[PDB]
Amino acid sequence: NNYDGDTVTFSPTGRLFQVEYALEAIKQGSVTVGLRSNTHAVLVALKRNADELSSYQKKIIKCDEHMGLSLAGLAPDARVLSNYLRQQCNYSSLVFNRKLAVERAGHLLCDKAQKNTQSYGGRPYGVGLLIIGYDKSGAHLLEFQPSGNVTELYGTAIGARSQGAKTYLERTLDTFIKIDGNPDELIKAGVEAISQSLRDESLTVDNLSIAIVGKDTPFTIYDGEAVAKYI
Amino acid sequence: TGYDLSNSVFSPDGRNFQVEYAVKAVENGTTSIGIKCNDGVVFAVEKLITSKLLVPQKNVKIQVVDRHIGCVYSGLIPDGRHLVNRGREEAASFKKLYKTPIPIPAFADRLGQYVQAHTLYNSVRPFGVSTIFGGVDKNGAHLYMLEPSGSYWGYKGAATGKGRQSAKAELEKLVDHHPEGLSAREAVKQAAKIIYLAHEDNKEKDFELEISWCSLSETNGLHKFVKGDLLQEAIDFAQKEIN
Amino acid sequence: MTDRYSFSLTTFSPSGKLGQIDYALTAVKQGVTSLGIKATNGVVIATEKKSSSPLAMSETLSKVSLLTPDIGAVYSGMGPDYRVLVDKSRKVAHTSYKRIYGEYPPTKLLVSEVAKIMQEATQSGGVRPFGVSLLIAGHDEFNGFSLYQVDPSGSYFPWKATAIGKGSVAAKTFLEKRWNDELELEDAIHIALLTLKESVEGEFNGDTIELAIIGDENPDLLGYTGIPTDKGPRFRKLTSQEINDRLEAL
Amino acid sequence: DRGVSTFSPEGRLFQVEYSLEAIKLGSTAIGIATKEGVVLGVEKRATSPLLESDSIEKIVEIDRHIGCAMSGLTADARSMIEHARTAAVTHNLYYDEDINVESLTQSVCDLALRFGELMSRPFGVALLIAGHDADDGYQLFHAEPSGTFYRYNAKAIGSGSEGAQAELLNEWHSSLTLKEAELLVLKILKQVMEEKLDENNAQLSCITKQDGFKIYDNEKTAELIKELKEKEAAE
Amino acid sequence: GYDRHITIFSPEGRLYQVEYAFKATNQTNINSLAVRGKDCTVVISQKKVPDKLLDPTTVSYIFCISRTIGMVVNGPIPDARNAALRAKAEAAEFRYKYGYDMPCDVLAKRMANLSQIYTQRAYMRPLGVILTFVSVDEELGPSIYKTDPAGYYVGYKATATGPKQQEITTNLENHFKKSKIDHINEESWEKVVEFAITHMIDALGTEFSKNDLEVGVATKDKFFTLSAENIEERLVAIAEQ
Amino acid sequence: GSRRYDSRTTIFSPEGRLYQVEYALESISHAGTAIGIMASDGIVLAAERKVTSTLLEQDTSTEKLYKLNDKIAVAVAGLTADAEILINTARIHAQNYLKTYNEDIPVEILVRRLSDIKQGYTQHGGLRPFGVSFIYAGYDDRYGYQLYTSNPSGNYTGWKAISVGANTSAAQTLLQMDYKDDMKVDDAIELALKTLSKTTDSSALTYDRLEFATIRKGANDGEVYQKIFKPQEIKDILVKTGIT
Amino acid sequence: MDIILGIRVQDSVILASSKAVTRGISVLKDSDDKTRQLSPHTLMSFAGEAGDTVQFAEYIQANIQLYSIREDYELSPQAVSSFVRQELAKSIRSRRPYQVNVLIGGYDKKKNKPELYQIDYLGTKVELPYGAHGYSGFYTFSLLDHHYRPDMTTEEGLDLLKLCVQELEKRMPMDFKGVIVKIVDKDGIRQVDDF
Amino acid sequence: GYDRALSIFSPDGHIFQVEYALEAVKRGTCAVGVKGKNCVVLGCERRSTLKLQDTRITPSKVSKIDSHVVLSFSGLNADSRILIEKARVEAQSHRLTLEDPVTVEYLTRYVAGVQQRYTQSGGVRPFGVSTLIAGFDPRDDEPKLYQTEPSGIYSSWSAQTIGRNSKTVREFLEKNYDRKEPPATVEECVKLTVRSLLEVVQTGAKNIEITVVKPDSDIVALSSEEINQYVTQIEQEKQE
Amino acid sequence: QFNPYGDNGGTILGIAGEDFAVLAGDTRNITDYSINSRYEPKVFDCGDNIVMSANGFAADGDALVKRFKNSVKWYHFDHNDKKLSINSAARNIQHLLYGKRFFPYYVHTII
């Protein structure tokens, strides 16, 4: 209230309002879901158009051959953070000849976001990210929030009405966790999960976006006629 | 007034209200503890299970600095990470120049001065964590707790977070009932108990326990996590004591 | 971090006053009285060593400071502000004069430099004005004896005699009565001690009074012999004993 | 006051939202994408009859295959166009090829949020970036000061835009000829413009794969305007 | 009144931030005291360890700045340690640059100049501490020099600092009225420490165990702090009197 | 952060004025009146000291009139300290021009650069303006004798006669009344003093409350001399015009 | 580059400058004007290191033109010569100095006198009745020491120049392809078209 | 360095510092420019609360940028010097690198760019100046007149006015200037320029300045007498 | 004095058919009169159907190839997975090499 002028100010209850308002832009963002078995990890994203003449804003960005994310909130902020991540995955390759651990990718995003929450003149990032990757210790899903908090999960969802998908996944846990060595089934469980968050609309061909990465599948994106398979 | 809107401003009573507000964010966090033992230290923390979807064992919060120092913190998690990253740079630098690994008291002041520096200007925000840390050096075992003001002291035992008072009470009993000393394996069990006991203040969600330790005899003076048989054994000891 | 205060903290109010210079002068008003009198063969500057506790050793606190061997300063206002100005004033006499011309600056020019430093604290980013007024007494070959007052604004004026601080209005009046252009140095010391007794409340002696002169050269204070054209400092701080000697014959 | 980089409680940047208001005050700009080309039209809006209207440059060449129309604080567009041209020419130098329209647009949109306490405020102008490339054909992009860009089959921006956009919603179909599109832009401009549309207070342009980006002379648009009235008179 | 938030003048020519920094000085509720012997300088400060969970050995407000200089701080510990580290650095650099041990009074001046800057420059706050520097200077003999957030400093015959500073001050003033001299006319530092503790007891009207106190002693060529056992020896010697 | 305490010295009012410039001018309006009068054969600078005390050392003093080079001088109205900063700048800038071109600096060029420096403080950097107005009196071989004024806005203008500081409204009407183009220096001297005599907020004009300077062709053929009057000389010129 | 001469007579300054531009064993051009007009009554010839010469000349020209516009007034030859000297005196202690020698011929309208300034790349200035840069001076200075008179007409100065060029064409090893002659007087700068 | 964003958006999408810079221009002395068939004339009001001026040495209101281009303005005078200097430097730099003097459009676009830059740079306020920029492109006889303003928007004008009471004189020029037939001669164009100023000024005494610019760097200042003739002749015709 | 270059020997060879191209190189790597390795390949698949070899000083050659591979990666990221044509690859490599004009990659490059 008097304490939301900038990120360098604590409230008397110990809250950071600019960070919380940054968190709020995620909530207004279109829904996206992440989930994973032991062999693959999938991102499903609902894309949002401006009107019937416009394209549907991309929500999924590839970071490396073995890693990528989905976004909810300020798109340019995700571009910045995805670009940083591309650089970090790249540095790991060129210098160490090593694929960047998804867990380290999490730590690096956390520390980048945090610095903007403690310094004057900056602003927190206004986007939440879901990072999937397949690394030396299997399939992974990460949830990034611009508070800096990064969390490893079996599944989740973020954006508007993400709670529907999140409870579905919370129910479906023991089933989808064991969809090993079957790409199409894990994707279906993902599409089903996102559907719990739809209202007055359902999934169309140029509305839906899926990405998958796993044991012998490079991170790749499916849009358009290539998603028709799943509606 | 308006003395509380800008960091590094003294109020008329002589206080920096922004630092005090940072403490509120600390008090809001999960409980974490440290117990000094005969030849070592033990760290433990409460990890709230927000959901079934959290992969168990896979959101680690205790952090190692160098090879001999353990750090755990309650409050804003990224702030704690920023502080440990700095601690790691400081330890690297000390090692680089002086060869020997950084003594724990020396390390404590490095965090102390850095945190304190964030109370000197209005262009930075104070740290939203209280940090319990320590380890084993050439002079024995040390446990420290450090607050947003940059204030720190050595401790026999220490706690912070929502369950700080429950844990403090429980720690005082140990200190009183073991004047001669507490062993590392003993301290690992007590730590587990005290976290389970301090979980009462936070009890909608059930939690995941996480312990670590450095002991001259039990870990060779290095920081190692407690898992497998030794963790479950300590979980069980705690399960027993709440019933 | 970093000084993000790159803007002026002293600015014009709608009436055209510069608030912080005005308030600095108010801080000087509160300060202990100090004065200077200019004789024909010397200058005297004086002030009260108002101690903080009797457990303090007031010799360790010098309110009258040597700037060059022929220039001394005294102040009224905030002591710590004065201390750093003396530090900066000493260094500037070297860096921007002695290291260039191989001789110490003439009084007016050193005064000019100090004023510059004080003006800048009135306009630069992120600083307040200095909370002092200085009286600078000095001698130089071509200008003879002189006495200047320097205010928080960075303004300076040459004076025959004046006073600043607490009881300045009274002291200035007492000096107008007594000052003439034929005063010998001893007469001015005598007048200085008289003018000062007005403003001191408690004890009045050689341990509560700080007083220096710009007078004759002191070869006994030079430190060495053998260069006859080097004759030593004209600045001399009168001893506790020396002051008491003059109070018996007050 | 309160910092330039501040979030509102709704989770939006004040300064970006306020620049969006400034853009609404701007003169109308319309773009339509066809399989035969992309048309760009603008309302010149001379603020007085004494001002020589062909000096109002609100449609602009970026490269031979990319054009741009603007609406809002048009002085803010100069450096965006300067960057766009440099990026396009630089790309051709580094890669001996034409820069993609999307890549060009992304490059301009990176400038957008580089403001704060870098420039002091967001741009107060939106851009319609139109062009052709081998991979994705004829394209139209709406580039905002938020750093967001959207692809559109057709789009209007500026003061007349909500009315114009609703009109474009009806009139656009995937088989529009270039000529049909030219007339549509003229039709919709005449609708939303305050003063009466003519060759002097509106301007047309297109970009075809064959001839690249061309601004139309006042003679050529005059004939299209004449042709538009005749097609409306006849039903 | 933003003139109350940063170090610019108020209309009555005052610096409220400096004044409020003096109030932080007593936040710890500790009193300190320093006196000079013939050969030595002794500084005693109360040691209050509230929490039982603390390691009492790590709780201190006395610092060894150089081999010869000791410093006791009255104020919050983060600012205290900030001042201690800086003073240690400044004393080391001085030795390196000028080839002799930095004197007590010069270090006092240097830290005072540093504090002065924070009262003039807006981006830096004052440190909420008072720094009492002690040594046996090689030119000046036993020395006490004290620094405050205003940037003021001066040498003392003896001094005290804290909430009940005035009681201790007048207690000492009355002794020097009576004794007629600048110092404690005593041979050994042990007996000067005994004096210091004794007059602290009278002025505060309280009794101390070995763990209620903290003692620093400066002799020629070393400043050192006493252990609890060394203090217990000293308390015992007073009790048998 | 620090934005809280920023006065924003370089912004516009809603009426399109510069607050800090306006208020600086208001500061200057209480300063001792300074007058410049230009004749066919020279220039007069006359200025009134802010109320002197009898104990002020009057001859070793300079508060109002300053020598920029051998051919150019200024009369100051405002903060002395501020004016000295600008004067040293102007003194250096004159020397740079001489070093570069081996010719004394044309009066306007020096004036323009000082005025440009002032202008900068009103447009960028977030600092307070210099609370100073100058009257420039000087000679060069292009325009001969010249008078200029500059003020905190960095605006400068040329004059036959002009005043700055206190009571300029009154002074300007008196000058406008009695000034004629074919005037000589000694007539100008007389006008300058008689104007101060009538506008002063003092009981009457005396030598000790004045500074005075002329720039004549008064030396040896086609070469120019600046005369900063000593106290005794002002005393005489006061008698020689019948004001005392 | 190579040959540049200047002669100051009663009412004008005459500058002669060789037309050849040689690189290696090829005369690339035989009609080069090694001169820039700085202001309407000031001309500068130049010779020295390839590239530097024109770069330096045009830089000075730009600065003097800027001054002319700013003050709406023409700098005296003396003032321009001092400006040019200072730039060279700067340059000689730069990372890469301008290796250019110049002659500045101007008519000072306040004095109604022609003036000739010889400045080398080090920034060495002298005002002279006649001057030359490079090897030329080794023949022309002594020739002019003999034939030159202070009160000569422009027409007499041109003949004195023909003598200088004749001698250089007789005794100089290189073919410098004649000179372009330019006169600077009270009416400004003009070029003699047949020499 | 001083960093503050002084030019920023307000909730209605206005940049108040730019708009307040325009208020400063409104307060400035009037300036008008009219282009004939074969010339461009710049006319400037000089406020008449100032006698004892020295006009020999006081800054003239029309400034030569190069020998073929001139710039006049309304607003803060000290601000205008900064723009004029930069434009002059750019003019010389353009000649140096392109080996051709600036076109009027180019020089205008540069000055406009400087002005725009000061509306979104930290630590600076916008220029409180609008300019009229006039002249003839090298080897071209077609006259050019452009206007710039604090925001940085610029455009071409058959005739235009800026500063105080510019609405009055714009009104006049709007009903008195035929696009189809511009002032066929210098004589004609100067006359229309003076008439428009006389709607607003006072007497055309020491109050009106006029500058004529013809092709090929032919730029001259008119002086009192010849202006007075125009004032005189305009009034005697007006008594109908 | 330290010499930052070496000569790792080998030789490479490229030929273009109507609908194919080949890039060959020997697998020997040497310094002076010694063999370092009998199998150290220096002809690489760089993606997008471009093959590349940078023969001469192997450290420089590996650095260049490494950088070009990276260039292809980013070209995909920045231009919507567009295929890098051989002509555009060639031009990109010119800028890679010429960027070190005053401290060159000592390699003969063929793609």
Swiss-Prot record, chain B:
Top-rank taxon: Eukaryota
GO molecular function: mRNA binding
Post-translational modification: The alpha and beta forms are probably products of the same gene with different post-translational modifications.
Main location per the UniProt record: cytoplasm
Compartment(s): Cytoplasm; Nucleus
Keywords: Acetylation, Cytoplasm, Nucleus, Proteasome
GO CC aspect terms: nucleus; proteasome complex; proteasome core complex, alpha-subunit complex; proteasome storage granule
GO biological process: proteasomal ubiquitin-independent protein catabolic process; proteasome-mediated ubiquitin-dependent protein catabolic process
Subunit structure and binding partners: The 26S proteasome consists of a 20S proteasome core and two 19S regulatory subunits. The 20S proteasome core is composed of 28 subunits that are arranged in four stacked rings, resulting in a barrel-shaped structure. The two end rings are each formed by seven alpha subunits, and the two central rings are each formed by seven beta subunits. The catalytic chamber with the active sites is on the inside of the barrel.
Membership in a protein family: Belongs to the peptidase T1A family.
Note: Present with 12000 molecules/cell in log phase SD medium.
The protein, known as: Probable proteasome subunit alpha type-7
First and last residues shown, out of full length: 6 to 248 of 288
Swiss-Prot record, chain D:
Modified residue annotations for Phosphoserine: S48
Primary residence: cytoplasm
Gene Ontology CC annotation, any one: nucleus
Gene Ontology process terms (BP): proteasomal ubiquitin-independent protein catabolic process; proteasome-mediated ubiquitin-dependent protein catabolic process
InterPro entries: Ntn_hydrolases_N (IPR029055), Proteasome_alpha (IPR050115), Proteasome_alpha-type (IPR023332), Proteasome_alpha_type_5 (IPR033812), Proteasome_asu_N (IPR000426), Proteasome_sua/b (IPR001353)
NCBIfam families, A to Z: PRK03996.1
Protein family (similarity comment): Belongs to the peptidase T1A family.
Protein name as annotated: Proteasome subunit alpha type-5
Encoding gene per record: PUP2
Curated annotation (Swiss-Prot), chain H:
SMART domains: Proteasome_A_N
Function as written in the Swiss-Prot or TrEMBL entry: The proteasome degrades poly-ubiquitinated proteins in the cytoplasm and in the nucleus. It is essential for the regulated turnover of proteins and for the removal of misfolded proteins. The proteasome is a multicatalytic proteinase complex that is characterized by its ability to cleave peptides with Arg, Phe, Tyr, Leu, and Glu adjacent to the leaving group at neutral or slightly basic pH. It has an ATP-dependent proteolytic activity.
Positions of post-translational Phosphothreonine modification: T58
Location (main, coarse): cytoplasm
Additional remarks: Present with 16800 molecules/cell in log phase SD medium.
Cellular localization per UniProt: Cytoplasm; Nucleus
InterPro entries: Ntn_hydrolases_N (IPR029055), Proteasome_alpha (IPR050115), Proteasome_alpha-type (IPR023332), Proteasome_asu_N (IPR000426), Proteasome_bsu_CS (IPR016050), Proteasome_sua/b (IPR001353)
Name the UniProt record assigns to this protein: Proteasome subunit alpha type-4
Key words, A-Z: Cytoplasm, Nucleus, Phosphoprotein, Proteasome
A GO cellular component entry from the record: nucleus
Record note on quaternary structure: The 26S proteasome consists of a 20S proteasome core and two 19S regulatory subunits. The 20S proteasome core is composed of 28 subunits that are arranged in four stacked rings, resulting in a barrel-shaped structure. The two end rings are each formed by seven alpha subunits, and the two central rings are each formed by seven beta subunits. The catalytic chamber with the active sites is on the inside of the barrel. Interacts with CIC1.
Name of the gene encoding the protein in the UniProt record: PRE6
UniProtKB/Swiss-Prot annotation, chain I:
Keywords for this protein: Cytoplasm, Nucleus, Proteasome
Cellular component GO terms, alphabetical: cytosol; nucleus; proteasome complex; proteasome core complex, beta-subunit complex
Subcellular location: Cytoplasm; Nucleus
GO BP of this protein: proteasomal ubiquitin-independent protein catabolic process; proteasome-mediated ubiquitin-dependent protein catabolic process
Assigned protein family: Belongs to the peptidase T1B family.
Quaternary structure (record): The 26S proteasome consists of a 20S proteasome core and two 19S regulatory subunits. The 20S proteasome core is composed of 28 subunits that are arranged in four stacked rings, resulting in a barrel-shaped structure. The two end rings are each formed by seven alpha subunits, and the two central rings are each formed by seven beta subunits. The catalytic chamber with the active sites is on the inside of the barrel.
Function: Non-catalytic component of the proteasome which degrades poly-ubiquitinated proteins in the cytoplasm and in the nucleus. It is essential for the regulated turnover of proteins and for the removal of misfolded proteins. The proteasome is a multicatalytic proteinase complex that is characterized by its ability to cleave peptides with Arg, Phe, Tyr, Leu, and Glu adjacent to the leaving group at neutral or slightly basic pH. It has an ATP-dependent proteolytic activity.
Record protein name field: Proteasome subunit beta type-6
Span of the entire protein shown here: 20 to 130 of 241
